[model samples]
Target: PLMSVGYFNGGGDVTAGPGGDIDKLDVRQITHLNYSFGLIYNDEKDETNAALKDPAHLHEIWLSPKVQADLQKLPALRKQNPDLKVLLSVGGWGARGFSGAAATAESRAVFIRSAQKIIQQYGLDGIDLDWEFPVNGAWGLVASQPADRDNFTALLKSLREAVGEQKLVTIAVGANAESPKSWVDVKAVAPVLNYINLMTYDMAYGTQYFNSNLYDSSHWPTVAAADKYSADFVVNNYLAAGLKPSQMNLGIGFYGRVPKRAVEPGIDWTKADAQNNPVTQPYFGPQQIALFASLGYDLSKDTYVKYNDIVGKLLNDPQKRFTEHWDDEAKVPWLSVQSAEGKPLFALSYENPRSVAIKADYIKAKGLAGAMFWEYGADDQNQLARQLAESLGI
Candidate 1:
């Protein structure tokens, strides 16, 4: 049977927290639920970089009061579905200290003990490490060392040895080829992990491009870069790096990549734009740059918009300020905005029911393990989740 895993981010960051009440989560169809996240306690001695801050308290696996409160609601959910394996995911995009924690055998032992402590204390089924990237850095704050590659493997090995076979050990990996190829010894780590949850979203940031497109799309401004970021490319990269298809779980983000305002006009939704050639000119033109500058928005930066909010605030609103468009080449849906007078504005790239079906079918065809979403709350009435279940024939 295919796994339907979801990261229940009840205590996640501000931008994309749980979309709805955590107590009201639907877990009947979910195989696994990951609590996001438990941070790595940075020690005073190991503060080398400015990004690495020594925390006030030094619990190996640090869960905030909010996380503790949010976790209390899970037992009821677990009781409802005994088969649902609830794992505590450690580390996230901005959270630091993995490199230091995984540096030495003693540190690995300490990290493993704390992980075990949390699992046993909370009666958790397992632990999932979300160390964004081992050798590569994320959010510009996370620690990245050359030794992270071996240290990560050592850390997982230590955890696996301590927890044994009954407990599930997994990791949420980056979607790009360079990220894994540079740091993760997939072949070495695969034997120790139960599943490798590939984070296939956030492929594009700070610009107008498909956030989590399934396949390569020629319509993108940079074809070379687009191919590398596609979900297909990530899977291929991992499989070539020695991951079994049965152990790979595809990612589906319940969010979209949105710019502050409208993009340069005459962006061809389907065909290549006649005015702005995809090859020569950048996606954001002078006019769009000026618009963002006037609004005090960084033209180079993008923000995440959850699927549910996109529905209530934009797509399903009575005003209809946004119109939906699909990219056949990429097998994903995108959004285009228009002024009250129907003038073309900016664009947003996100996952929808249609894209979910395509990704589900791809998962089935490729014989991949299953699908995983960042957070359950982002789904609008479980629209995308239900679509994934139906399309994958769960």
Candidate 2:
């Protein structure tokens, strides 16, 4: 069976370190850690670019003493197991140059050269390609063509040989349903890379949505009734595309996707101003009489918030009257606060421990590779991560 792997964002700087306890994570629980993300210098964007790019200039994962030292900590982490591979992921949202570089044979060679050299120097075990989207215009790096479908496959095939046998190779992919743009030519890339990390998370519409809800959201009908964006849907698509279950890893988001503050029911439970946000004085529910202090929700604005804290709190508190509903079809739990219309006013799309455990079981039942998360630290008190590990029996 495949094992658990995690993506650890290097914050803004390489040496900036992990925001939470990830800096000192146990080498045992996690089998791999992807130290994201390295970028190409602006000068080289024309002839060279890693699969994953960053618009944030060169974030100095390399060439800095402090940063290099931070990376060495993992190799030391490896010594404990030596099997715990730490990879330097290249490219991210808004990163570019892959099109230009992958366009030519000579340029592909140059990219491979630079990547391998850096890979060796950093003492990393391998590389994870996070090319946001290859075809569907990832993030904002949308210079994709139909030709890209074939070329991405070509790129990985060449990259495979170039990186050599000592290193591991993996590429991050999206659950292509909403748009074909970000969809990858999985068949071609599958045989060449070590693992195709299907970003089964974020498989939702971008505008104030949830990710990996197991089934398409009840609110949207973007696809044919059965042909929707969900964990099983994406996996079956890949399977239908001839991908081996062993070659794929399920991507889970350890974070919560919050609706905009101006949007109807915000994440904030403490106050309400048409939008759920913090207010000057405390307020009650629709009745405006009862005061539920402990159920104080202060989750402000963002498309993505990294905690299940609010979701867990709201459901447990009696005053909140937050109800948890399981999408029998989706196999995930969504939450909402009780409202007068005989409906829960605010709809919260998040993964509960039960939902997460179910997903882990799905991974095993499907006889698939294993589980991977966007970032390691998003685990709140290791609740979800531990659940996944136990469920996976790893």
Candidate 3:
């Protein structure tokens, strides 16, 4: 059977606000539940903090009080479904301090020991490292060094040895044009990992495009560089890089990407209509981003609409302002917003049951491990998760 893994965000998303109820999770759909983000904290920098000033205090896996309370419920959750394996996912985008931990052997051992402590404390089955990058920096604040590439592998190897074969050690890797294979030696670490969760979403940004399209659309315009913005490209890329199909799990997001601006009418999203219109562009350059920012457009707000919001607000809007458009070639859908008077507004890219089902089929056909989604809170009704489970016949 294919694996059904879901991430439950302890920090929460737009839909959940600060947090959500963990007891509401439908364990039937998921074989593994990864508690989002056990941070790698370097408390040694604090001179006044003497409780953990020992040599082993170089790096520690820290979980917030609220997150700890949420994680503590997993024992009861497992009683409901004994097959479920809970893991504490460490690190996330902009969650730093990994460099200080993985820079040397002593730090790596300390990090592993700290992580093991958490695992034992929580009765977790394993740990999932969601390091944004090892060698490549993220959000301009996280440190990156050339040694990070090798240190990453060494950290995982030591972590695996500490946990033993019974426990799962996995990594959530990048799957876009910014290839993670450049920083991670997948061949070396594959031996130690149980699953390589490829974040196949977030493929397109800075312009209107499908975020998790299963295949590339031929109708989409070409850019200067290779713009293979689809899940298939990333999966094939990893396969070529020596990742085993059974060890790989493709990520499907519970959320969708909303365009920063409205698209022109009759644009078809096939090509770039106009600079002001902001139709789908194969790539967005620096000047294009600067221009968009100058226009008072912020990419953070009103974007990343979760499946619940997409259904409640956009799809079933009482005003009926958004019209769904399907791209046959790309196998995804986008919402074209219209003015109340029927004037064309902008477009938003997102995933639906149809798109996720196609991806589930792809997983089975490709002999992959299974599906991994961003968060459980986003699917308020389990619409997308049920679709994936039913499609995968789990």
Candidate 4:
């Protein structure tokens, strides 16, 4: 069964403010909502605070009175949407080194117990551990020892035992299949938690060190051929690590990662350089990327392009080569784009409606759980979210 339609709130108070109205969401369509709460506040000297800092302690932080208000409103939300599950997420890209604390049994107990208190206080349904990583490098944090893998699993096992079975326990894991070896022992932790939400995006961005395709494509060389990772590769890696398909949730990014140019010539026409070099161009979120493409800029030959805002444009443009290049062997999509100046750029594309439909079908074919998105708010005005939800028949 589908775990739940969900979104992550890392923007804190800003998300709960004028725009963060959970009530406005199509409650019937969503089942899970993950709200972020940062741990181990880093100070001016880049030192970690021993105790949790109040949102007021930091400037422009996302914590606010709105969070409390939102917390109070969640029960009512559950009342309206009986299947809705609200969870508190800890850790993010900013708070690295949390695993140092989470690795130790005592520290993990302290953190998980504290989180349980907070969850109960806020009436949240459960907790989502966004540790960024388990055993490998996290932000500026030190890496975990090999034994830390089992310790990580033990820590979650403790949380599950302490929180009881009614509460949900989900994890936001790295997209890399190597993550299990580096940080997580899926075999140990799978039994203790609900599911693993795999972050499958950002594996390939414009500024990445690798020169690889962004989306899944057939012609591009596979990982065995010195290429970067793909969405399917990441999932298969986890499956290979003994993770049940029903307990795995694949992620889709609402944003687009624009590359400099395409691999082959005569594929794309319109192009705009970010500043000067098209090959080293920066990535843009959905809105910006779509706006640029709508202005008649060609994105066809770029590394890879996500299909949310540009679906209509691609559908409308007669000359647009918007057809996704899928690699049946890899079960991934591949596309290319070039700058106006004709520099080659390749991208490994993420899952979209068409790609998502493929993934959803694959999940169903394999009897997997369901799909996940980076953020519900980032959906193409809920179009992609709805499409995925419909695809899953959730």
| TM agreement with the true structure for every prediction | 0.85, 0.75, 0.84, 0.71
Q: Is candidate 1 or candidate 3 better by lDDT?
A: 1
List of clashing residue pairs for candidate 1: 262-345, 262-346, 263-346
Candidate 2: Cα lDDT at 289: 18
Q: Which candidate is the best by lDDT?
A: 1
Each candidate structure's count of clashing pairs: 3, 8, 2, 31
Candidate order by lDDT, decreasing, is 1, 3, 2, 4
Candidate 2 stretches with Cα past 4 Å from truth are 13-22, 42-69, 139-142, 178-183, 206-210, 216-227, 259-301, 308-324, 338-343
lDDT of 2 by residue, 1-394 (tens): 6678877665442222344433566556677888776654433333233423444433222323334556766656676666687887776665555655565676667677777887877777898877656666564444555556676677778878988777898988777753223357766677778887877865433232345676655563333231236778778877877779998888887765433321423223323462434322221243411212334434332235454554455555556676666666566665555545565543445676787788888888888899888666556666777777778887
lDDT of 4 by residue, 1-394 (tens): 6755466553442212132466665556666877755454323344344343433333112234555566666766677778778887666654544545555666676666676777778777888877766566553453445566776677788889999999999888886656876678888888889888887666543233222223455454322222257666678888898898889887766544443322221111124552343333233335435545665545553433334434554434476534445555445454443434554334334445565566667667767677766565555567767777787888
Off by over 4 Å in 1: 14-20, 43-59, 206-208, 223-228, 259-302, 339-346
Better of 2 and 3 by lDDT: 3
lDDT for 316 in candidate 3 is 81
**Winner by TM-score between candidate 4 and candidate 1:** 1
Q: How close is candidate 3 to the true structure, as a TM-score?
A: 0.84
- Predicted candidate 1: what Cα RMSD to the true structure? 5.5
